[PDB]
Amino acid sequence: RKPPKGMFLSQEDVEAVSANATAATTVLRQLDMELVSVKRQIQNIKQTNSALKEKLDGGIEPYRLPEVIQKCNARWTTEEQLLAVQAIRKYGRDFQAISDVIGNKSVVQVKNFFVNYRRRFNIDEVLQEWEAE
Amino acid sequence: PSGVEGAAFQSRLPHDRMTSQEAACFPDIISGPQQTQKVFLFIRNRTLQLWLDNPKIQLTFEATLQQLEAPYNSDTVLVHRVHSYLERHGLINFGIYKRIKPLPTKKTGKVIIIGSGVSGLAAARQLQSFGMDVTLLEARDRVGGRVATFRKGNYVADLGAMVVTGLGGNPMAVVSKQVNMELAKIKQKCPLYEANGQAVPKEKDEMVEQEFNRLLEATSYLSHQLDFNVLNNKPVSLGQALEVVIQLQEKHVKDEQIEHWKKIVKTQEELKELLNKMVNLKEKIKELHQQYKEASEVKPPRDITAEFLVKSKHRDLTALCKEYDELAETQGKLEEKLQELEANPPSDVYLSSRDRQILDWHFANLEFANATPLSTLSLKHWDQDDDFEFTGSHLTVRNGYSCVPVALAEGLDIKLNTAVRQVRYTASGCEVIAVNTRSTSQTFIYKCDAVLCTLPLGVLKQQPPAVQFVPPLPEWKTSAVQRMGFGNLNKVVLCFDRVFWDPSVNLFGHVGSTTASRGELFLFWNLYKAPILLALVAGEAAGIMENISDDVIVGRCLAILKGIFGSSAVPQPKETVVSRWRADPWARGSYSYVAAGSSGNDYDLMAQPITPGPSIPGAPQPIPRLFFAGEHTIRNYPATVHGALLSGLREAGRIADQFLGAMYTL
């Protein structure tokens, strides 16, 4: 039914290692080369990745900005409203980024704002100019 | 098995079914009713049992019916038809038994038997047992043929046959009861010892062997399941097949390695793409921080657009830091996944040179078992006789196997030193022309009704022929002689003055340095009470070693032994013998094997007797005149003493039927 275990033989393989006198050592050489061909190319990319790793030395620790835990607020200060309008011009619909910029507005308060001052801050125009980028 | 059915088994017969030969002699019964068949079967089995239970005295028809019961002992013609058939075909009253009623007053028919090997002797006894005129013609100065026993002083060692390969249904089981035969078991535990002269660790010893057995099974799969049997018109040998399997195993090892390193490069090259992404991020992260820094330097109070810039860049920065953190997360996973794959590679090699050498010893051992290079054995058929193997321990004849042919030879017309040179057979009878081996010009002529030829295959193989057939043997028979393989394997008998080896071990191996030399002195037998070691030359080596003087051989022998037991533990052997079977004129080899391009069927062709053409044209179809027994004629037990024995019994039967007619088919 099936060859013993730890023993591998397919009809296809048999015909390949018999086609001529040395088809045997021909096929076993192609793999011998093919292995070295890959084995070398492993070290080649091990070298590449080794160098790229040393560029990334120091992590990004000289660039990390401390935590700003500030409580989400109900009120829209004129300042906060202006930050908003500008953030829209820069971020479009990304309510998450816009919420992050203002700092004390929930991702939904932002969406509310979008509808509340919709006409007064021509958010129509403001949004279509963001699209023009 | 035991009881009545045990006897049937012990006689190589299905206890609950009529054989083809029974169907021939009892065409009524087998085509008859199931009830009848079963009565018959019991009778047969019972009679066999009786003979078996006590095989040192003849079992007569009267003595038989005596022990039968109702309903069985009612029909005494069936009981007679049975006891006769069994006696005819040597299933009962064969070998060395005591005759109740001394031989028939006068002899009927005359038979010349060529060679007094076991097949010869067995057949002779039977023919004379049936009251025929029998003379055997032996070229040698002794009986036995390929049953040679060296004897000098107290040293006794078989240069020929030496093992009884299981008593389970072995006709030799019977014989060994009839003759005083000291039979000793053989502990099949065999420690190996490399070229350096040190044991092979139980670790490897097993890992190699198991791999061996696997490789064999593989050839068998390759043969039956894939039908890999004809390559470039030539029949595939076991050798080629074993090579192909090994290569394909070596291939797999590489296929594995290739796709595993291929696994690594894909991951390594994934890690690369990620680092590139990471560098190009730390790049913007650097510059973006600068910009936020510059925007923070603009000291307040600042208008809103300049305040937005600070807030903006802040967001943007933490956003890009979010990514880099996650990409450093990914990095750590892919970076360990690479130590994962570099922790467990697939196997380095299929087999080392140390492995491949021990594997060769197993191959040599198999070459020893077939007395031939595995490159000659038929892939499909080499083992066809596997199923007929006897049950029980293999045994050694302690007092020398020769005691058997010698015991058979007692009371037989045997012309020793008589070399059959020509066999002429015609419609009216045969004459056999032999010469005296000593003074060769002294010529003998033998006239007979029938010639039974137990000439070794290697002999029937000779070219130019050692024996002429007049008229020539029909091409169908000669082809079968060409096709069949006749191998070789030699022994070195080393007789010392003391047991310097492990007495609890029967056999130990030595591992050769090459494939080419794998069978050279590859195995040693300690069997006897006496300090005798027996060393085997098998495979390709066997044929080559015959061209090497005994001293040189015994040299290589002591060498190996010293190398294993200590350079000062191994004395000089008091007596040595070296067999040369291929060289021997009356063997031209050791025993047969199924060569590639042959089959079990050829063995049948060997047994088929020869019927001469008619004398006067248009006269009736002649009787068969020329008959063949011998180890090479018995499909189901080739290359063995019992096989020979049985072939002899077989031919005797057939000849008796031919010339004494069938009294037992009415």
Ligand SMILES: Cc1cc2c(cc1C)N([C@@](N)(CCc1ccccc1)c1ccccc1)[C@@H]1C(=O)NC(=O)N=C1N2C[C@H](O)[C@H](O)[C@H](O)COP(=O)(O)OP(=O)(O)OC[C@H]1O[C@@H](n2cnc3c(N)ncnc32)[C@H](O)[C@@H]1O
């Ligand atoms: C050679 C050899 C053979 C056997 C063994 C060793 C060697 C060395 N060992 C073993 N092989 C078994 C191998 C083995 C053992 C365990 C597992 C697997 C395999 C063996 C070898 C080494 C160690 C132990 C045993 C065995 C053994 O242990 N057990 C066994 O049962 N058979 C073993 N065999 C095979 C059997 O020995 C053989 O099948 C059997 O004996 C053959 O009986 P034939 O068919 O009757 O042929 P014939 O030649 O005896 O008689 C014919 C006569 O004709 C004359 N004649 C010729 N020309 C002329 C002429 N012109 N004019 C006139 N005359 C002429 C000749 O001179 C001769 O007298």
